[PDB]
Amino acid sequence: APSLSNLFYDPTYNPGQSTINYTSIYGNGSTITFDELQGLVNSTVTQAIMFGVRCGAAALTLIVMWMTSRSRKTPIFIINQVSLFLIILHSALYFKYLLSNYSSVTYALTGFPQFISRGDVHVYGATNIIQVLLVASIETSLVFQIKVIFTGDNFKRIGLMLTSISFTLGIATVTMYFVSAVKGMIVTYNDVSATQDKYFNASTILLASSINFMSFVLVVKLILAIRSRRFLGLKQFDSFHILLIMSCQSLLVPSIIFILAYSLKPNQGTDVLTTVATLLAVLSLPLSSMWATAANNA
Amino acid sequence: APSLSNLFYDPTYNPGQSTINYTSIYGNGSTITFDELQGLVNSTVTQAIMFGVRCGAAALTLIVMWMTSRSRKTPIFIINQVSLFLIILHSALYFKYLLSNYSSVTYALTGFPQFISRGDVHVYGATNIIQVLLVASIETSLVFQIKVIFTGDNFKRIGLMLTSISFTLGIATVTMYFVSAVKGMIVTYNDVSATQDKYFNASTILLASSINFMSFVLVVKLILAIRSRRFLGLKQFDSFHILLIMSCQSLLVPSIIFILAYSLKPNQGTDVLTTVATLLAVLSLPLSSMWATAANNA
Amino acid sequence: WHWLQLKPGQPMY
Amino acid sequence: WHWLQLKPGQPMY
Ligand SMILES: CC(C)CCC[C@@H](C)[C@H]1CC[C@H]2[C@@H]3CC=C4C[C@@H](OC(=O)CCC(=O)O)CC[C@]4(C)[C@H]3CC[C@]12C
Ligand SMILES: CC(C)CCC[C@@H](C)[C@H]1CC[C@H]2[C@@H]3CC=C4C[C@@H](OC(=O)CCC(=O)O)CC[C@]4(C)[C@H]3CC[C@]12C
Ligand SMILES: CC(C)CCC[C@@H](C)[C@H]1CC[C@H]2[C@@H]3CC=C4C[C@@H](OC(=O)CCC(=O)O)CC[C@]4(C)[C@H]3CC[C@]12C
Ligand SMILES: CC(C)CCC[C@@H](C)[C@H]1CC[C@H]2[C@@H]3CC=C4C[C@@H](OC(=O)CCC(=O)O)CC[C@]4(C)[C@H]3CC[C@]12C
Ligand SMILES: CC(C)CCC[C@@H](C)[C@H]1CC[C@H]2[C@@H]3CC=C4C[C@@H](OC(=O)CCC(=O)O)CC[C@]4(C)[C@H]3CC[C@]12C
Ligand SMILES: CC(C)CCC[C@@H](C)[C@H]1CC[C@H]2[C@@H]3CC=C4C[C@@H](OC(=O)CCC(=O)O)CC[C@]4(C)[C@H]3CC[C@]12C
Ligand SMILES: CC(C)CCC[C@@H](C)[C@H]1CC[C@H]2[C@@H]3CC=C4C[C@@H](OC(=O)CCC(=O)O)CC[C@]4(C)[C@H]3CC[C@]12C
Ligand SMILES: CC(C)CCC[C@@H](C)[C@H]1CC[C@H]2[C@@H]3CC=C4C[C@@H](OC(=O)CCC(=O)O)CC[C@]4(C)[C@H]3CC[C@]12C
Ligand SMILES: CC(C)CCC[C@@H](C)[C@H]1CC[C@H]2[C@@H]3CC=C4C[C@@H](OC(=O)CCC(=O)O)CC[C@]4(C)[C@H]3CC[C@]12C
Ligand SMILES: CC(C)CCC[C@@H](C)[C@H]1CC[C@H]2[C@@H]3CC=C4C[C@@H](OC(=O)CCC(=O)O)CC[C@]4(C)[C@H]3CC[C@]12C
Ligand SMILES: CC(C)CCC[C@@H](C)[C@H]1CC[C@H]2[C@@H]3CC=C4C[C@@H](OC(=O)CCC(=O)O)CC[C@]4(C)[C@H]3CC[C@]12C
Ligand SMILES: CC(C)CCC[C@@H](C)[C@H]1CC[C@H]2[C@@H]3CC=C4C[C@@H](OC(=O)CCC(=O)O)CC[C@]4(C)[C@H]3CC[C@]12C
Ligand SMILES: *[C@@H]1O[C@H](CO)[C@@H](O)[C@H](O)[C@H]1NC(C)=O
Ligand SMILES: *[C@@H]1O[C@H](CO)[C@@H](O)[C@H](O)[C@H]1NC(C)=O
Ligand SMILES: *[C@@H]1O[C@H](CO)[C@@H](O)[C@H](O)[C@H]1NC(C)=O
Ligand SMILES: *[C@@H]1O[C@H](CO)[C@@H](O)[C@H](O)[C@H]1NC(C)=O
Numbered sequence: 001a002p003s004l005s006n007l008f009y010d011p012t013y014n015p016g017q018s019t020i021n022y023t024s025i026y027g028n029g030s031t032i033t034f035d036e037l038q039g040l041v042n043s044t045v046t047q048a049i050m051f052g053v054r055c056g057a058a059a060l061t062l063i064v065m066w067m068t069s070r071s072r073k074t075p076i077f078i079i080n081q082v083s084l085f086l087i088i089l090h091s092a093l094y095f096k097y098l099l100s101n102y103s104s105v106t107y108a109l110t111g112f113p114q115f116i117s118r119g120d121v122h123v124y125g126a127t128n129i130i131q132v133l134l135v136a137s138i139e140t141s142l143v144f145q146i147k148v149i150f151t152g153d154n155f156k157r158i159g160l161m162l163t164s165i166s167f168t169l170g171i172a173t174v175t176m177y178f179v180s181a182v183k184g185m186i187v188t189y190n191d192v193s194a195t196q197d198k199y200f201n202a203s204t205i206l207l208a209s210s211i212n213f214m215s216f217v218l219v220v221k222l223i224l225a226i227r228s229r230r231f232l233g234l235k236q237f238d239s240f241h242i243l244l245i246m247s248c249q250s251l252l253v254p255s256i257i258f259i260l261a262y263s264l265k266p267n268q269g270t271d272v273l274t275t276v277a278t279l280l281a282v283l284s285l286p287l288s289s290m291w292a293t294a295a296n297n298a
Numbered sequence: 299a300p301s302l303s304n305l306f307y308d309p310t311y312n313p314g315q316s317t318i319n320y321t322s323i324y325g326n327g328s329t330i331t332f333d334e335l336q337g338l339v340n341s342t343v344t345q346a347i348m349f350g351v352r353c354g355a356a357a358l359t360l361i362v363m364w365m366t367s368r369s370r371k372t373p374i375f376i377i378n379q380v381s382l383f384l385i386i387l388h389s390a391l392y393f394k395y396l397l398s399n400y401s402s403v404t405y406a407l408t409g410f411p412q413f414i415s416r417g418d419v420h421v422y423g424a425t426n427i428i429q430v431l432l433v434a435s436i437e438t439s440l441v442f443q444i445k446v447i448f449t450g451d452n453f454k455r456i457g458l459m460l461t462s463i464s465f466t467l468g469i470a471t472v473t474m475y476f477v478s479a480v481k482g483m484i485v486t487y488n489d490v491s492a493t494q495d496k497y498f499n500a501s502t503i504l505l506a507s508s509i510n511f512m513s514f515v516l517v518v519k520l521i522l523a524i525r526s527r528r529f530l531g532l533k534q535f536d537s538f539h540i541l542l543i544m545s546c547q548s549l550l551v552p553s554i555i556f557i558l559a560y561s562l563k564p565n566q567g568t569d570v571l572t573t574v575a576t577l578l579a580v581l582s583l584p585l586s587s588m589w590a591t592a593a594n595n596a
Numbered sequence: 597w598h599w600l601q602l603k604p605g606q607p608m609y
Numbered sequence: 610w611h612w613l614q615l616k617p618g619q620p621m622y
Contacts, residue, residue: 001324004323005322005325005326012412016404016413018320020318020319022332023305024303026300026302034320034402035404042397044339045346045397046397049346049393050350051350052348052350052354054350055350056355056358059355061358064359064362067585067589070592098343098347099343102603102605104332106336110332111604112311112313113306114310114312128608131608180608181608184602192605195603197601200602204600261600262597262598266598271601274609275609283358287361290366291366294365294368392620401619418618426621482621490617498613498621499613502613564611569613573622
């Protein structure tokens with residue numbers, strides 16, 4: 001503490017317009033303000049916050065789903081476990097990414113490819129493969145939720161149609177995620193300072209449209225299946241009510257979160273809200289099973 | 299892109315020893331390296347990760363505990379709700395703190411009190427009050443877990459002794475947290491660039507020792523209560539086994555996390571692992587109730 | 597409204 | 610081993 005400068009006593013000076021001087025590949029001065037830097041750090045912290053929420057919610061849902069799911073060896077239980085373990089493992093690799101040398105402001109300000117370690121490239125690839133397997137597990141669950149729920153309906157013509165369309169969408173999104181993954185891998189392995197996000201947007205919209213399709217089918221069907229129970233009988237509080245509530249939640253909240261992720265300001269780190277939408281689309285079914293068992297037991 | 303400097307082609311140069319030039323209250327140059335800066339940002343991101351885990355785990359545990367807890371209007375249920383809502387609200391205020399002007403590198407590098415908004419001081423105070431209420435709710439639960447579990451034991455002499463000591467520890471930690479809070483508030487309100495963490499360490503060790511005491515009592519008691527059931531009867535898989543497992547988990551994991559938080563390298567943002575220890579000490583009881591009901595129902 | 601942007605090596609969301 | 614440090618205005622952990 002040699003001596004406090006005059007600007008410590010001025011009540012009008014703001015640090016946000018002050019300039020940082022640092023070295024970069026493009027030039028020598030490359031001035032940047034503390035508010036672009038705090039935007040970068042706030043985006044990184046916001047991504048970390050949502051991925052922490054994902055990791056904690058998925059881990060505790062996995063733990064609770066074991067403690068209480070009496071119907072072990074069901075395919076939907078095994079799929080739900082594979083999906084929760086893949087959410088946890090994806091969140092873990094991402095938690096390394098946020099604390100690595102690609103999310104650091106060292107690389108986001110100074111585009112130096114020497115700072116890059118090839119292990120970080122391998123972590124990037126492992127995360128992309130785990131995301132592909134996650135989408136595969138989610139669509140396996142959904143094709144297994146429409147196949148099983150369409151068994152027993154007299155109108156099996158339209159049930160088979162619905163299974164077919166859903167399964168087509170599942171294969172299309174899984175193939176698009178794998179194509180996006182490999183088209184990002186060849187570019188990253190070749191040049192560490194480039195990206196291929198062209199197919200990303202398409203694969204995420206494909207997944208969102210699949211989820212939207214599922215919530216439509218499950219809500220339409222359950223609506224006709226409580227209208228048939230209201231013209232004869234009544235539908236106000238049975239487990240029927242729990243499935244209908246979770247399917248209306250799956251209808252309204254992940255779509256709202258997808259549009260919120262596509263509408264808000266860019267570069268603020270809010271773009272990973274699509275992962276909260278997929279988190280809730282995953283967590284609708286195990287929580288639905290828990291409520292269903294805890295309203296059937298009585 | 300005027301022209302890439304020579305250091306883009308050198309494979310030996312590392313950005314981590316390069317120096318940032320910026321203005322600060324102490325001087326004019328105030329050189330800092332990108333690796334101290336990335337340490338700061340990594341500490342902020344690590345705090346955000348653990349608080350995201352807290353928020354997601356507590357929110358989904360609150361949601362699940364409603365869906366399945368058939369014993370509504372019990373005091374322990376109401377306390378567990380108050381504690382989960384206070385964990386969520388504390389995590390929310392902290393999530394504002396990490397995205398505010400006190401966790402920004404703008405203030406952690408340039409100690410300018412002009413950048414500080416009085417609303418951030420009010421957020422700081424609200425977070426400290428909510429933490430005091432959280433510790434109060436946790437100790438209310440524990441004094442209510444030892445009071446209720448010690449009812450019915452023939453050896454009520456030592457049961458009352460145990461209740462008394464636990465309740466003394468609860469009041470001591472709540473009073474120490476409130477003293478720490480007010481001693482931090484008067485300093486922050488007076489001078490925004492000072493802190494009073496002297497009483498913090500004492501209050502956290504008091505809370506850790508309370509939790510340790512509880513896990514001792516519950517494990518000792520349940521051990522004599524399965525040794526009496528092993529000399530007459532057998533103790534290998536009953537709900538008895540579920541409480542004993544959760545009490546041994548509460549015995550071993552939060553203490554391990556407390557020592558890990560006190561042992562690892564400082565200034566790396568790992569010091570908030572004490573909040574994961576308190577998270578698990580909270581989440582032992584609702585998960586214990588869920589397993590107990592889901593092993594009593596059959 | 598905007599397209600999601602991946603930083604030069606951001607793994608998949 | 611170290612004492613927990615609060616930044617100049619870090620709210621309570
Ligand atoms: C659902 C919940 C209750 C399960 C338990 C999860 C926690 C025990 C996990 C989740 C997040 C984890 C943390 C995520 C990241 C880090 C940072 C890591 O250190 C670094 O990355 C710093 C590197 C550097 O110095 O640059 C040390 C472990 C730690 C604190 C982890 C410790 C274990 C934590 C708290
Ligand atoms: C019961 C389990 C299946 C779920 C609940 C706990 C997990 C979510 C925890 C347990 C172990 C944790 C991991 C322990 C150690 C690490 C290494 C850590 O590494 C770094 O941060 C390195 C940073 C650097 O090298 O710069 C990142 C978090 C991670 C994967 C943790 C992520 C969260 C994990 C998987
Ligand atoms: C599914 C749930 C239960 C989580 C399972 C744990 C794994 C996801 C974690 C545990 C330890 C982690 C590893 C710990 C350390 C490293 C070294 C690390 O080395 C580097 O390239 C970075 C070195 C550096 O920091 O300078 C690469 C990731 C890796 C293999 C980590 C990959 C992810 C692992 C296997
Ligand atoms: C929900 C059920 C009834 C099906 C509805 C019809 C689907 C087959 C449509 C609805 C939305 C469509 C998607 C809307 C937007 C895109 C992005 C498009 O690529 C881009 O726009 C990215 C590049 C760019 O424009 O910058 C590729 C097709 C795709 C995935 C479309 C594929 C066909 C989809 C899934
Ligand atoms: C199953 C249930 C419990 C889920 C409940 C989720 C909602 C309560 C969450 C999900 C997404 C959230 C939104 C995600 C992002 C934002 C943006 C956030 O910041 C801005 O609007 C930016 C303003 C600016 O530009 O300065 C305000 C809150 C809001 C709308 C959030 C409000 C709360 C929402 C709707
Ligand atoms: C799984 C269930 C039980 C909980 C769901 C909680 C989420 C809906 C919350 C948790 C973290 C929240 C985010 C935390 C921080 C921010 C940043 C915030 O923007 C700012 O902080 C200002 C702008 C900037 O900092 O650059 C906008 C809302 C957002 C995305 C929040 C939106 C709502 C989120 C995703
Ligand atoms: C009880 C359960 C069902 C609630 C589940 C959802 C909540 C955990 C979400 C809903 C609204 C969210 C909040 C919405 C907005 C914000 C503001 C955000 O900060 C900013 O936007 C920037 C502020 C600044 O500039 O300093 C920090 C996270 C926070 C408190 C979010 C924390 C997470 C909250 C409480
Ligand atoms: C109990 C669980 C379910 C969470 C409930 C949500 C609340 C904890 C959140 C929701 C919106 C939040 C508020 C959103 C915005 C602001 C303005 C914010 O104003 C400032 O001083 C900063 C302004 C700026 O960013 O420049 C202060 C915090 C506050 C009141 C937040 C306090 C915390 C609130 C009430
Ligand atoms: C678990 C049951 C059987 C009770 C055991 C005895 C307790 C009354 C002891 C055990 C640990 C003790 C604590 C250990 C350390 C401290 C920190 C001490 O303050 C400091 O060391 C902080 C300042 C500094 O040294 O930098 C104040 C007393 C306190 C809370 C002690 C209070 C008395 C405690 C709770
Ligand atoms: C019983 C169920 C319900 C929960 C089980 C959770 C555990 C598996 C978690 C809780 C605390 C966790 C630990 C908390 C913190 C850390 C430190 C973390 O980072 C380091 O050790 C730092 C290494 C370095 O200095 O680089 C490594 C994982 C570890 C041991 C975690 C491993 C996983 C643990 C034991
Ligand atoms: C309803 C569920 C299934 C989610 C899908 C919501 C759509 C209405 C969103 C998703 C992607 C959005 C588009 C993403 C990108 C842009 C930015 C912008 O694009 C442009 O035409 C100019 C910029 C450019 O060339 O990319 C104008 C809005 C548009 C087309 C958006 C219009 C609204 C879209 C189609
Ligand atoms: C077992 C459960 C109840 C958790 C408590 C573990 C204790 C064994 C820890 C908690 C706080 C620790 C202390 C925190 C700070 C320091 C740093 C350092 O302190 C000093 O005496 C020199 C520096 C200083 O004056 O603070 C040497 C270890 C010590 C005393 C630690 C010794 C081990 C302690 C007492
Ligand atoms: C930083 O860069 C600016 C160019 O805008 C220059 O005027 C200044 O001399 C450099 N050094 C400092 C301490 O600002
Ligand atoms: C960058 O600026 C400093 C300041 O004079 C100078 O010494 C250095 O030579 C400059 N770098 C190049 C490549 O000119
Ligand atoms: C940063 O400050 C130091 C000392 O004032 C100076 O020697 C150095 O040239 C400056 N860095 C740049 C890139 O100009
Ligand atoms: C800080 O360094 C710059 C570079 O010359 C100079 O213009 C400025 O006057 C210095 N600030 C003070 C208070 O001397």
